[PDB]
Amino acid sequence: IDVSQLVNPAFPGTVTCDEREITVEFPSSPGTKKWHASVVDPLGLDMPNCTYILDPEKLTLRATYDNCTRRVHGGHQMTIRVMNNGAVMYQFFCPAASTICQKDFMSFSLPRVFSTKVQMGWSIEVGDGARAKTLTLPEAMKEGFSLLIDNHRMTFHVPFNATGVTHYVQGNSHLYMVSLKLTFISPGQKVIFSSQAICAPDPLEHHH
Numbered sequence: 132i133d134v135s136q137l138v139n140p141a142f143p144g145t146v147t148c149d150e151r152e153i154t155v156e157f158p159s160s161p162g163t164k165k166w167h168a169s170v171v172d173p174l175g176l177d178m179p180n181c182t183y184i185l186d187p188e189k190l191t192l193r194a195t196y197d198n199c200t201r202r203v204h205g206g207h208q209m210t211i212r213v214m215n216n217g218a219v220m221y222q223f224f225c226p227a228a229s230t231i232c233q234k235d236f237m238s239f240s241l242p243r244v245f246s247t248k249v250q251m252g253w254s255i256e257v258g259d260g261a262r263a264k265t266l267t268l269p270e271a272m273k274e275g276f277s278l279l280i281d282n283h284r285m286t287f288h289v290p291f292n293a294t295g296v297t298h299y300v301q302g303n304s305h306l307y308m309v310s311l312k313l314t315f316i317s318p319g320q321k322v323i324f325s326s327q328a329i330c331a332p333d334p335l336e337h338h339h
């Protein structure tokens with residue numbers, strides 16, 4: 132008998148640990164159409180400042196890390212209560228650049244990792260809030276990213292004028308940044324971290 136499944140049951144759907152929020156994704160079923168869900172402390176008591184979003188069409192529950200989770204060793208823990216019309220509780224856990232500059236380019240190199248059936252993978256993202264991860268080679272090269280690939284590494288070369296490079300100016304200082312997402316995939320759980328490849332020039336050098 133596996134007692135750890137009696138005290139800590141496995142959620143029958145997916146969970147996503149985002150940079151700013153937790154998305155719990157329930158399995159689609161007519162029986163799950165008769166469920167209600169709420170965020171609770173390990174005793175089942177409502178957490179006071181926690182506000183969360185329910186989407187009945189996508190069957191998702193979204194909660195911020197602040198006020199909705201408890202800090203545990205290695206990261207954050209959240210508890211939800213699921214009720215019919217017998218009740219069940221589930222707990223979730225979320226854990227807490229080699230850039231090269233050039234006169235007209237920035238360059239960086241990233242591992243081709245791609246690997247208990249756990250996967251690790253990288254992706255390039257562009258835009259602010261509305262956009263998505265353009266990881267796919269057609270999209271990345273449509274944004275101007277030239278790519279060198281060997282058995283062990285992936286190396287990117289992008290001009291500063293490229294659409295995939297966000298450019299910031301605060302007075303005389305200039306900053307070039309490509310955002311990256313490191314994605315881990317496990318059965319029933321996705322975990323996403325954020326990262327950047329950043330190349331700031333010298334103001335005198337940038338002024339030419």
Ligand SMILES: *[C@@H]1O[C@H](CO)[C@@H](O)[C@H](O)[C@H]1NC(C)=O
Pocket residue numbers: 179180198
């Ligand atoms: C909830 O918000 C109130 C408002 O100031 C604050 O006093 C309290 O500490 C908060 N509780 C938390 C963050 O657990």
Ligand SMILES: *[C@@H]1O[C@H](CO)[C@@H](O)[C@H](O)[C@H]1NC(C)=O
Pocket residue numbers: 180182197198
């Ligand atoms: C979360 O807790 C903080 C405590 O500093 C409070 O200021 C805030 O209003 C609470 N709610 C949200 C949605 O952040």
Ligand SMILES: *[C@@H]1O[C@H](CO)[C@@H](O)[C@H](O)[C@H]1NC(C)=O
Pocket residue numbers: 235290292
């Ligand atoms: C891209 O670089 C070329 C040559 O360096 C330049 O002519 C062009 O204006 C740049 N694109 C921009 C600044 O959008």
